[PDB]
Design a protein around this nucleic acid. Structure first.
Lengths: 96, 223, 107, 63
RNA sequence: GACGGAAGGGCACCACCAGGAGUGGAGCCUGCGGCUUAAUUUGACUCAACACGGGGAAACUCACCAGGUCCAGACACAAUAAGGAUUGACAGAUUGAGAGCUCUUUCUUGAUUUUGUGGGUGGUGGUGCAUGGCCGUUCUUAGUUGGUGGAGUGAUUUGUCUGCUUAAUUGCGAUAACGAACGAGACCUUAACCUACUAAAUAGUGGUGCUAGCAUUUGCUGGUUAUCCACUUCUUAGAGGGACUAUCGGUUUCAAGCCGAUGGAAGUUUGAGGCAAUAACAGGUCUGUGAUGCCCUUAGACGUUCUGGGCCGCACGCGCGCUACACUGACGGAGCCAGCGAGUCUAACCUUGGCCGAGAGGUCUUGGUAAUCUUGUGAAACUCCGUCGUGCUGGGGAUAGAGCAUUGUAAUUAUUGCUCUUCAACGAGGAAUUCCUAGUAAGCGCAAGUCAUCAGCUUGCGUUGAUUACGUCCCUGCCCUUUGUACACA
């Protein structure tokens, strides 16, 4: 949906801090905790990078496990413009 | 809050059948073989004691840091508890998923409907499988009847404590021509399991005495 | 205040009664190691948590009725316990899903 | 209407081949001497086989 | 092999013969038709569809009839936005929704892709004669089978049997068979016996700290939101015993039987439950799976918004039931019984009471996330004592009418109750036709399930409890031997 991307990049802000992009199920509720934007139209750009990979997928229990893949560097050199190895392919917790 | 005595063991499955639906469905390529649930307070023991536990290090933060915060962040457990751990599963005859996932990469090629089936299961047919039951159905040949009722084993069932020795599985794959449903039944041994009842009541062995005494012109014994 | 014996209502519960009687036994046996004065093991009634539905996924045929149920086993005890015997309990008397917390009173 | 069952009928002749010269008419001490050392799996699977041992050697003295 | 209006065997309260409950009579919910409405969405139509699909449906549901906005068009690959793409819009003309639905129309609006050939596949859309998984039925049943040997060129057969018993292909006994692997049986539960235990008020005990009083016929009714708490048997089970058709007479191929009698908590696989094998139904579920091959559609949608009829519309048909035809009954007083539970979490569920008003019920309070409180579920059905009489009635409450409350943003086509107006049918019910043999047939009533509210329903829980057959092939149903078969989607 035609909607400005500081909405999306507060939520991609919520991705690279711990590693989650997860939507819930309702319409006109718009209150998911710790992803505090709308429940439904955030999906509208969340598949928009799925069509060329970039993220994994399952539905079950309508849980929306849509979390980024190994190629979460080259598009977020330009969509968040971050220096990698902070939440890229070697985001070490400590050792576990 | 203020948890009743009827709100966590009937609600065992809100977390325990959460993981068991997760790694049946998300990345069950690992050959899932249960979690060793000892839930300590403010820590979370993930033990995927599976076939591919070399993926507990991995990149040390590529996919594990997802799995720190996917099951733990959908019912929204508060972070600061989650620990991950693994170890290789073994003895691959006594587990349903061990030969099921030994068929979950053979259902594209065009192997036989029987050749892989009774060959791998003779890891335990000679070491503790008496009566098994494998049906690999779906539609392998477009007709009216689509079912292969494969029967193999040296059948001993049933005395009704059945859960002492049974494995169960059912799988699916979305191929060109519809689903292919692979449900098996693998039969563990109570004689190989070394636990509790040695065998359900068939195997009863009888020892032999000394040779019984004669009239015995007897004795002078004073120790 | 540490190490007084002031009549505490230690409460235990579990699922299968083999390991619930296990946990109570090696704590009342650990009520021997310094001899807690006590009118102790309250062999409390155990529970039945029945559901009774139709497990069929279609409404046809001679219809079906089953049950499926958890066994809440449950041992309230009348301890009289000190401050030492509550500490090491999170990984002693071990079984899958040990659950305990005690209010420090009975009167 | 409650005649006996086969897997305890055949089990005694691999069992009372051991200790024939016992198991007399009074059916109490022999009953636990039927339950003597064996690898049994319940109590009334063996009290039936002791009552099997009770009735089927009491009648040898019927000829 | 399957059949037969062929014998023979057996056995069947999903058929009888005694029975004990009866049905379909009325009215009225509750389904399935049809009726047709513009709409009565949809599957299931043979015991084996039809108080089934959780289905007691206001919205939520909802797949039909009605309307109108999001496109909720990921995008493989690319025309049109930069002196402007997408369009919300005040106030108004429409318009349930200021639904800028639509317009009257110029404020907002920027790289956030409107989309452009084509493609996500949303689908409660067809396809269980595309399906898996699952669930029923064949069958409340004894039926399967290899290892070897025997007969037959071979399909096959024998073992699994003319007898007798059984709940039984269970056992005995006969024997080209022997020895077995199954299912069943066995196994296991439970309302249980255990004052013997590891063991006692979030739980139950003789006592009695403080001891009011009837009464002195000297210990009783007792209480004491704990006083020392007296104590484990009742409450509850950690493993175990105790019962294993247990014992003698009758009759028995002396077995396999099973009874007269009875120690006993248990003599009927204890009564009843529980998972129940080989082989398959074009059984059924694609209107529960976001698992679905194909095809209709892919935003002018069969997704998805938000209010109405609906599945709740009417000669009539058939399916499950509920109140009854009263006078071992009805009304009024006295006494008074269960177990099952499920109960609030950062919200408002169960709730004795206080006080109010006749109820419906309402405000502060009583305890409880739970052997704490509900609730001692004193309820009905029940026991005892006064009032009603041959009538459609002190049985009955269909039918419509008015008023008061409760739940829900929201009650009209009425969510339910309450108080009065309306006060009927119907009198034991046709050729049609079921269930069930001891705390069970029967009587009645409370939890839970759907549950804001809506049980005339369905599981259980219970409180009180007879019968007569004591079993069998004519009707109906099923397995086995023998024959016959021009049949094999039999």
């Amino acid at each position: 949906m035609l909607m400005p991307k500081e909405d999306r990049n507060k939520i991609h802000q919520y991705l690279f801090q711990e590693g989650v992009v997860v939507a819930k199920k309702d319409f006109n509720q718009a209150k998911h905790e710790e992803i505090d934007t709308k429940n439904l139209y955030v999906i509208k750009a969340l598949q928009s990078l799925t069509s060329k990979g970039y993220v994994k997928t399952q539905f079950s229990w309508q849980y929306y496990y849509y979390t980024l893949t190994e190629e979460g560097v080259e598009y977020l050199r330009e969509y968040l413009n971050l220096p990698e190895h902070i939440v890229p392919g070697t985001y070490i917790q400590e050792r576990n | 809050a203020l948890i009743s005595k009827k709100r966590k063991l009937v609600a065992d499955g809100v977390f325990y059948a959460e993981l068991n639906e997760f790694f049946t469905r998300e990345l069950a390529e690992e050959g899932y073989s249960g979690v060793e649930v000892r839930v300590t307070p403010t820590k979370t023991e993930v033990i995927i004691r599976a076939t591919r536990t070399q993926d507990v290090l991995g990149e040390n933060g590529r996919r594990i840091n997802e799995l720190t915060l996917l099951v733990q962040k959908r019912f929204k457990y508060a972070p600061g508890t989650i620990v991950l751990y693994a170890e290789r599963v073994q003895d691959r005859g006594l587990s349903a998923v061990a030969q099921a996932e030994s068929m979950k990469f053979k259902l594209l090629n065009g192997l036989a409907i029987r050749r892989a089936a009774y060959g791998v299961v003779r890891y335990v047919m000679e070491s503790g499988a008496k009566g098994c039951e494998v049906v690999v159905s779906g539609k392998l040949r477009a007709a009216r009847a689509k079912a292969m009722k494969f029967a193999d084993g040296f059948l001993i069932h049933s005395g009704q404590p059945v859960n002492d020795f049974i494995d169960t599985a059912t799988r699916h794959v979305l191929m060109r021509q519809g689903v292919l449903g692979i449900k098996v039944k693998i039969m563990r041994d109570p004689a190989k399991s070394r636990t509790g009842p040695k065998a359900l009541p068939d195997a009863v062995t009888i020892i032999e005495p000394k040779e019984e005494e004669p009239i015995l012109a007897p004795s002078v014994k004073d120790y | 205040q540490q190490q007084q014996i002031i009549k505490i209502r230690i409460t235990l519960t579990s699922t299968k009664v083999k390991q619930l009687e296990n946990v109570s036994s090696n704590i009342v046996k650990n009520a021997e190691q310094h001899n807690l004065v006590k009118k102790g093991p309250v062999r409390l009634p155990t529970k039945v948590l029945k559901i009774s539905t139709r497990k069929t996924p279609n409404g046809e045929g001679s219809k079906t009725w089953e049950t499926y149920e958890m066994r809440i086993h449950k041992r309230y005890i009348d301890l009289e316990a000190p401050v030492q015997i509550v500490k090491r309990i999170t990984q002693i008397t071990i079984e899958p899903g040990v659950d305990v917390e005690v209010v420090v009173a009975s009167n | 209407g409650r005649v006996r069952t086969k897997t305890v009928k055949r089990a005694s002749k691999a069992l009372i081949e051991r200790y024939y010269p016992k198991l007399t008419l009074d059916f109490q001490t022999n009953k636990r001497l039927c339950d003597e050392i064996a690898t049994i799996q319940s109590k009334r699977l063996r009290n039936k086989i002791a009552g099997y041992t009770t009735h089927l050697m009491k009648r040898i003295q019927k000829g």
